[model samples]
Target chain A: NKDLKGLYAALLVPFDENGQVNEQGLKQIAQNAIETEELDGLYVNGSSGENFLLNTEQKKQVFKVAKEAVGDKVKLIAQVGSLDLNEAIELGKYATELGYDALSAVTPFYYPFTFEEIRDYYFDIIEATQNNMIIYAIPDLTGVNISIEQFSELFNHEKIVGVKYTAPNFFLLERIRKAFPDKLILSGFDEMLVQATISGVDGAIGSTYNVNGRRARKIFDLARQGQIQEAYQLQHDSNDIIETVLSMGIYPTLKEILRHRGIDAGLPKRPFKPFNEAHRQTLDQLIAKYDL
Target chain B: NKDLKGLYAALLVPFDENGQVNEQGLKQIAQNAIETEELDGLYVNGSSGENFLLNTEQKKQVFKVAKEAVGDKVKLIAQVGSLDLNEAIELGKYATELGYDALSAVTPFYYPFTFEEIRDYYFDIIEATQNNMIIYAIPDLTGVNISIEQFSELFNHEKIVGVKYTAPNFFLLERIRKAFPDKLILSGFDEMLVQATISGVDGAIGSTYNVNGRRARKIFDLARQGQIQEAYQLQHDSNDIIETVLSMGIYPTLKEILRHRGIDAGLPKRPFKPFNEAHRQTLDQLIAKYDL
Candidate 1:
C-alpha cells in the first residue's frame, strides 16, 4: 500500500466537439503526467476529469483508456461514484476488474442522503468491488464535510483504506492525520500541497497537478525533508499558477495549457463552457512565466 | 400555459429490492395521485421521485409509465435535468416527445458551478430540447441560490417560462411574485402551502401532496378564496402530518402511507434506506390520525 503513497495527477480527459472522449489525447495526457511532469501516477475520472458529466459507458471508457495508456508501473485509482448507487457499484467492479490499484468514489450527493446512507454507500461499493477504497471527500464540491467521528467509522472498515482530503480546513486534516495514522491521506487541493505535506498527508491528487505536478512534487518532497522555506517558496509559485487557472476556470484552463504543449486538450463537456478565449493572453503569460 | 397552473403531486416512485422500478406500483401511484388524491397533475421525476438516484433509462421509463398511466387531461411536467447536459437534453427531448406539458430540471449540484455557468445550463437545455423549461430552483438541495437579477435573466427567455420555487425564503418569493407578475410560479414546499398560496403563487407541487393532496387543495383554495383562518387551520393539520412524516423520513413514510391504501408503494432507490420499522407504530398512529 506504501506504493500508493505519492503525488499523482488527477488526470484530465480530452473531449471532442461532440463531447466524445478523445482517446489519443487522453493517452498523451497520461504519458505527459508520468514521463514529463514526473509525477507518481494518475487519479482517473475524478472531479478534474469532469466525470459527473459523463455517462456510465463514458466512465468505463475513461477507466479503460487511462489504464491502457499507463504501464504496470503506474499506480492508477479510478473514481466510480455517482448519484446512482447501482452505477457506482457497476463502475467500481469495472475498475477493480480492470486492475486499478484502488477505487475512489465521490460522496453521494444532490439528495440530502443521511449519514448512515452515505456510510452504507461506501460499504456497498467495497462489498461488491472487493477493492481498496479511498473516500473522495471534496466538501467544496460535494458540500459534505466528514467529521472526525465519521472518518473513524469509515476508517474502521478494512477495505476503506483512505481519503482524498480536498477541503481548506487544516484543523480537520491535522485531527484526521493523528486519528488515522495508518490510513492513507491523499491531499486533494494542489494549491496547498506544502501545507498538507507538513500536516502528514501521505500524498496528494489534484486537477492542477495535470500541469503543475513537478512543482507539486517539489513542494511535497521539500516540506517532508524539513526544507520549509524552499517548500513554501515553491508553494507560493504554484499557487500563482493555481489561482490564475482557477480564475480562468480550472479544468478548461489546465486543458488549454496541455494544448499549448501540443496535446489535443479538447473542449470541456457541455455545461462547462470551454476556456474563455478572452483569457488567452493571460494564460499564455502563465505558461511562459512557469514554463509549463 | 395557464392550464399548467394547479395543485400537483411531486410523484413518488417505488423501486424493488434490486433498485428496479416497480412499474405496476408506479402506475398505481400515478393513478392514485389522479384518482384518489384528486390532484390536478403530476410533477414526474422530481427530488420526491428519488429521481437523481436513477439512471437515464430509469428516468425515461418513469416518464413513459407516468404518461401511459394518465390521459391527455393530466398536465405532466417531466423533470429531466442531470449534471450531464447531454443526458438532460436527451431526457428533455424524450419527455417532450411523450407530450409532457412542460419540462423542469433541477439546478446542477455537487460542483461549485458559477452563476453564469448555471444560467447557461438552463439556456443550453432549452436550446437543445426546444421545450418550455421551468427552473427547478431548490436552493436548499443545490447550494446555488438564484437572485432577483438572475431571475430576470432567466425569465427574459420566453422558453424559460417559470420556476418551481422550493426554497423557504418568503422575501425572495414575494419579490419574484411581484416582479415577474406574468411568469408561472409553482410553490414546492408542501408544509408551506398556505403561506405560498397567500404569496400569490399560481400553483404548488410537492411530495407530501401525493398522500395529503386533498387537504393541500383545501389549503390553497381556502387561502386564495379569502378564508385565511380555515386555510391556516388546515395547514396546521397538514403540518402535523408533514412534521411527523419528516421525522420518520418523508419519501419512505409517505410511500408507507400509500402502501396502507394497498398501492404497491415499493422502496426508495438505493442509498435512500427503506422506512425503518422502528418508527412503524408512530407512523401507523400518524396514518390513523390523519387518515392519510
Candidate 2:
C-alpha cells in the first residue's frame, strides 16, 4: 500500500445549492475517505468528483482543499485533463507544484484528433509540469480507446508512467499487463475491482470507493491474494450497493449516503436533479441492508 | 429552400508557422468559399477549422475574421461548442453579437455526461445568448449520440432548431429528416453529400467543400433536382479528392490543395503536421486530375 498499490476513492465532491464547491463539505468528505473508509489515497478531481462540470477555479479550489485536508503521507493523483490544452498545462503545473504524487490526463477528446495530436497533448503537459503522467483511458466516456499498439506508443515516453484502465475489455488489459510489468496500472472501474485486481492492476480509482472503500479494498486484496471465491463474493455484495446507488443516480445517492454519516453531502449541480425524494425509503433500506 | 438551407463549407482554416491564425490567408480562404466554391454558407470554427485545438481568444478571432471576410449575403454558422460551459456561453454570445445566422455546439464530450447534462448544456447556451442552437452531434468524435427520443427532448425547445449531423448512420439521418420535417438538418460528411442530399437534408457542412465546393454544390442541387446519376457521379469525383486528402492528413492536405490556387493555405496548426512532401507527387496528380 505504501508503494501506491492500494484502493483510492476517485474523490467525490460536495456542491452547494448554487452548484459551487462546498469547501468545508468537500474537506469533510476527503477526511472521511482516508480516516473512515480507510483508503490509502485519493484520486482527486476525476470523473467521480464531477470535475468536468466545474469551472477552472472551482476545480483548483477542490484540489487545494482536498490536499489541505489530507495528511502528507497520503497519495494523491490529480486528473487535470481538458479539451483546452492551456488549461490542462496550467492545472498540471498547479497540482504538481502542490506536491501531488502524480498527474493523469484523459485523452484530448471531442475533435477527431489524430494520434500525433493526442501524443503531443500528453508531451506538452509533461514538459510544462515535469511530473509523471498516468494515462486516463476511460473508453465508455471519452469514446477514444487506445489499442495495444497505441498503448505501446504512449508508454514509450519515459515521463509517462501508467494507465487508469476504465474499460471492460479484459483482453486488452491482459495484453497491457503482460507488456508493461513495471509501469503502474491503476484500475478505474469500481464494480470490476475483483476482475481488474485479478488481471494484475497495481491499484484502483473509483467513485463508489468514496463510500464503499473498505469493501472495495477487500475485493482488491482478496483477489490479488488468490482468494477468488471470497473476493468475488464481496464483489457481488458490493455490486448490490452499486446497483442501488446507480438506480437512485450515482452522484446524488452517494452524496445522500454521506449525509447519513453526519457529513454535509450537499446538492448535485444543476441538470443533475437532486436525489429524488420519492426514492428515500428504498435508498435507506439499501444503506441499512448493506451498511454502506 | 429555407433561409438557412444549402451546401456549406464547414470552413478549413490556415495557420502560420507559429500556430497563429493567418488572418489575411483566412480572408482569402473565406472568399474562395463564397465566389469560387459557390457554397451557400460558411460553417465557421467547426471541427474542420481545427476549432477544438484553439483557445478562447483564438476561437473568437476566427469568428470575427471569418465573418468579416464573407459578404453579408453569405450565410454564416458559428460553432461555439466546448466542454467548458462558460466558454460555450461566452462564445455563443460573441457569435450572436457578430450576427452569425445560427450557432452550433457539439455535445459536451470527454465526460460520460448524462443525456440530461448534454441537453441542458444546449438550453443553457440558448438561454444565455438568445441564439438559435443547432445540435452538433458527431458520435465519431464526441462519442455521445443523441438518440431519437433524446432528440425529441432537445428539439422540443424552440430555439434548438437543428443538428449538424456528422455521423455516417444514414438510417438515423432519414429518421431525423422524417420526424422533424421543418428542422434544419445539415449533413456533415463530405464523402456522403449525395446520399445525404437524397435523404432530404437541408444542406451539408464539410471540409471538402472548401476545396470542392463547386462540385459539392452540384451534388446537392442535382441530387435534389432528380438528377441522381449525375449527382452520384460528382460525388465520385468529389470523394476521389476527399479520399486522397484524408490519406494525406485532411486539414493539411486540404490547405495544400488551396496552395495550388495561389491561396496562402499555410501549414496546419501544429501538432497537425504540414502535408507530407512524401505525398507531393500523389497530391499534385490528384490536384491536376480533379482540377482542384
Candidate 3:
C-alpha cells in the first residue's frame, strides 16, 4: 500500500469534437501529470475525470487509456464508484485486472440511503474485486457523509485500505487520521492540499491538479518538509487561481486552462456549458497573472 | 405532442438478487403501469426509475423492455438525462429510434452550473436527437434551477417540448404554467399532483405512482372532472402514504412495496442502502393499508 502514497492527480479525460474519447489526449494528460507535474500516482475516473459522466464503455476506455499512459511509472487508483452497484463491481474488477493499485467509489447519492446501505455499497465493490479499496468521500456532491464511527466500521473490513477524503471538515479528517493510523488518507480538495497534507494525509487527489499539479505537488512537499509558511504562500496563490476559476466555472474553466496550455482539452461536454467570452477573458488574465 | 398529454409514471427498475436488472421484472412493472393502473404514458429512466443507478446497457434494456411492454398502448417518454452529455444524447437518440414518444433529462447537477450551462445542456441533447424534450426540474438534488425566463428561452426551442416540474413551489408552478400555456408541464412530486393539476400542469410523473398509480389516477381524474372534494380526499390519503414512504426510505421502501405485491423487486443498488427491519415493517403496514 506504500505504492499508494503520494500526490495523485484525478486524471481528466479528453473528448474530441465528436465527443468520443481522445485517447492520445488522455495519454498526454497522464504523461503530463506523471512527468511534468511529478505526481506520485494517477487517480483515474474520479469526479475531476467526469467519472459519473461516462458510460460503462467510456469508463473502461478511460481505465484502458490511463493504464497504457502511466504504465508502471505511477500508482493508479480507479474510481469504480457508480450509482449502479453492478457497474461499480464490474469496473472495480476491471481496474484490478488492469493492475490499478487500489479502488475508490463515491458514496451512493441522490436517493436518501441509510448508513447500512453505504456500508454495503463499499463492501459489494471491495468483495467483488481483488484490489484494495479507498472510500471516496465527497459529501458536497454525493450527499452521503460517513460519520467517524461509520468510517471505523468500513475501515474494519479487511479489504478496506483508505479514503479519498473530500469534505472541508478538518476535525473529521484529523479524527479519521488519528483513529486509523494504518489506513491511507488521500486529501480530495486541491485548494486545501497544504492543510490536508499537514493534517497527516498520505497524499492528495484533485481536479485542479489537471493543470496546477506542479504547484500542488510543491505545496504538499513543502508542508511535509515543515516549510509551513512557504506552503501557505503557494496555497494562497493556488486558491487565488481557484477562486477566479470558480467565478468563471469549475469544469469548463479547468478545461479552458488546459486548452491555454496547448492541450486539446476542448470544451466541457454538454450539460456542463463552457465559459462565456467575458468569463474566458477574465480567466485568461488570471492565468497570465498566475503564470498558468 | 398530443400523444404526450397524460398521467405518466416514472417506471421503477427492479433489480435481482445479484443486483443485475431483472428484465422480466422491469417489463412486468411497465406492463402493470400500462395495463392495471391505466397510466397514459411511461416516463422511463427518470430519477424514480433510478436512471442514475443503471449503466447505459441496463438503461437500454429498461427502455427496450418498456417499449416492448407498452408498445403503442401508451406514450413512452424516456429520461435520457446523465452527467455525461454524450450518453444523454445517445440515450435520447436511442429512445427515439426505439419509438419513444418523447424524451426528458434532469438538469446537470453536482457541480454548480450556470443557467446558460443548463440551457446548453438542453440544447445539446435536443440538437442531437429528433425526440421532443422535457426539462426535468429537480433543483433540490441537481443544485441548479431554471428561472422563469430560462424556461421561456428553453420552451422557445422547437424541439424543447415541456418540463417535468418536481419542486413543491406551487407559486412557481403556477407562474410557469401561466407563462407558457403551450408547453406541457408534468408535475413530478406525487404528493403534490392534485395541486399541480389544479395549477394547470398538463399531466403528472412520479415515483409513488408505481404502487399508488390507481389512486393517483383517481385523484387526477376527480380533479380534472371538477370533483374537488374527492380529489382532495384522495390526495390527502396519497400524502399519508408518501409520508410513510419518505419515513421508511424512498427507493428501498418502494422496492419493498413492489416485493410485497409479489414482484421480485430487490433492494436498491449500492450507494442506497436497504431499509432496516423497523422501517421495512412500517413500509409493509403502509403498503397493506394502501392495498398496494
Candidate 4:
C-alpha cells in the first residue's frame, strides 16, 4: 500500500483509424500521465485505456509500450481480466514478465456467471501468472456486482491483493473497507474521489486523472488530511470536467483534452469515432476554462 | 423474417477441468437441443454457450461442431460478438464462410461505448461479413440499453435483420414489436417466454431452452394460438425449472440436467465451478418434478 497508495491515471490509449494501437502515441500518452499529469502510477489496459476492446496482441503491446515509456518507479496495474480466461492468463503472464507491478482483471462478464465462476477466473489467472491480483469491479460497465461476502471469499486468496472499486455504493465500499482492513482498496470513480478517500480507500485509479492529475492528487491528499472543504471544491471542478467530458463522450473527449496538451491523443479506436466537430467550440472553451 | 421462429436454445457448452472445450459433450448438448428438446434452432456461441469466456479457436470450434451436429435445416445464429471488434469480425467471417444462417453480436460492452460506436460495431460486422445481423441486446448483462429512437437508427440498415431482445422491460419490447413490423424479434429470457410470445416475439433463445425447449415451444405456440390459459400454465411449469436452475447456477445446473439423460454434459468452464453437491438434492427433486 505504501508505494501503491497514491493517485493513478486509468491510462488513455491512442489508436489509428482502422483500430490498430498507436504505439508511439500510446507511449507519449503513458509518459504524459507520469511527466505532464504528474500522477504516481498508470493503471494500464483498464477500461480507460479501452483495454476490453483490444485483442491479446494489442493488449500485450499496450503493456509493453506503457512500461517502456514510464520510469521503473511507476506503479503499473495491468488489467488483463477478460471473458477469455486463457487470454487473461496469457496477458497476465506477459504483463508480469514485462515488470508490471500488479495484474488486475475485470470480472468475467456478458454472461450470468455464478459467483464461483467469477472467483475461479481470478484464481486461474493468478495460478497461471503467479502475480498479485486486483479484481477490477466496475459493475456499471460490466453489470457484474461483487457482494461483500463474495469479496470476503476472494480476499481469502493471498495473491488477490485488492479491488479497483468502481461502484458508487459507499455502503458496500464501507463494508469491504471494514471487513478487509489490510487489503488494498483503490477507489475507481474519478468524480467521487473525495467520498472514497473519506471512506478510507488506500488509493484511486481514474480515467480523468490522465489530464487532471495535479488537481486530483490534491483532492485525494486534502480529503485524507481532513481538509474536507478544499477537497470538495476540487471535486466540484473535477466533476465539472467529468460531466462535460461525459456529455461529449468520455474516452474520445478525454483524448481531445489530451490533444490540447500536445500529446498525440489520436483518434479513439474505431467504432469510437473521432470527436464530433460539433463539440469543438464547447470543448475548446472547456479546455481554456479548466486550463486542461 | 428468415423463418427463424419458434423456440431456440442459446446452446450450453461443457468444458474439461482445464477449461478446454469438450467437443463430444458439446456435440451431444447441441443435438439434445434439436433432437430431444425439438427446439427450432440453436443459438450457438451465445451467452448460454459461455461464448464470451472462450478464445477465438474455441469459438470457431464450437460453431463448427454445432453446425456439423445439427441437421442442415436447423437455423443457426452464431454469436460472434466480442469486445475485440477484430475477433468479432473474424468470427463473423468464419461463421459466414461455414454457412451459419445468420450472425448475432452482443452490444459492445464493458466500456461506456456511445450508441454511435455500438451502431457501427453492428454495421461493421454486417458490412464485413455481408451476413444478416441480429443485435444481441442483453442490457442486463452488457449494461447497454438501446432505446426506441436508437433502435430506429439501427434498423435503418436492411442487413440489420433483427434483435434478440433479452431485457425484461416489456414496454421496450412492445415498442420494438410495434414499430418494426418486418424486423425479426427473438426473445432471450426463457423464464419470461409466455410474456414474450404473447407480446409477439418471433422466437426465443435462452440457456434454459437447452433443457426446456419443447416446453418453451409449447408456450410460444400456445400463446400465439390464443390458448392463453394453457400457455400460462406451461410458463408456470417452465419457470419452476428456470428458477430451480437459477438457484443451482443455470449453466452448470442445466448441464447437470443434461447429465440425467445420460449425455456427458461435462463441466462448465472454470471460473464457473461444477454444480454444487449441496444443491444436488434440491435439483434432483426439481428435475424429477419437471420430468427433466
Give the alpha carbon lDDT tens digit for every residue of B213-241 in model 4: 77887888889889999999999999988
Among all candidates shown, the one with the greatest lDDT: 1
Select the stronger candidate by TM-score from 1 and 3.
1
List fnat, each candidate. 0.85, 0.49, 0.87, 0.79
| Candidate with the greatest TM-score versus the true structure | 1
- Cα lDDT tens digits for candidate 2, B242-280: 898888888898888888899998877655668889999
- Please tell me which model should have the higher lDDT, number 1 or number 4: 1
TM-score of chain B of each: 0.98, 0.98, 0.95, 0.98
> Candidate 2 DockQ score?
0.42
Candidate 4 per-residue C-alpha lDDT over A1-292 given as tens digits, one digit per residue, 9 for 90 to 100? 3367777999899888888988988988988889988999989888888877887888888988999998878898889888778888889999989988889999877777778778888888898899899989988777788888899899999999889999989999999999999999999998899999999999999999888999998998898889999999999999999999989888999888888777788888766778988999999998999999
Clashing pairs in 2: none
Error of 3 at B39 (Å): 2.5
Which of the two, 1 or 3, has more DockQ? 1
| Per-prediction CA RMSD (Å) | 1.2, 2.8, 2.6, 2.6
2 or 4: which has the higher DockQ? 4
TM-score of each: 0.98, 0.91, 0.92, 0.92
User: Which regions of candidate 4 are displaced past 4 Å?
Assistant: A146-150, A169-179, A222-232, B226-228
Name model 3 segments beyond 4 Å from true: A71-73, A259-262, A274-287, B71-73, B255-284
Ranking by lDDT: 1, 4, 2, 3
DockQ ranking from best candidate downward: 1, 3, 4, 2
Give candidate 2's chain B TM-score. Answer: 0.98
Two-chain DockQ for each candidate model: 0.82, 0.42, 0.65, 0.64
For model 1, residues A181-236, the per-residue Cα lDDT tens digits are: 89999998887888899999999998888888888888888888999999999999
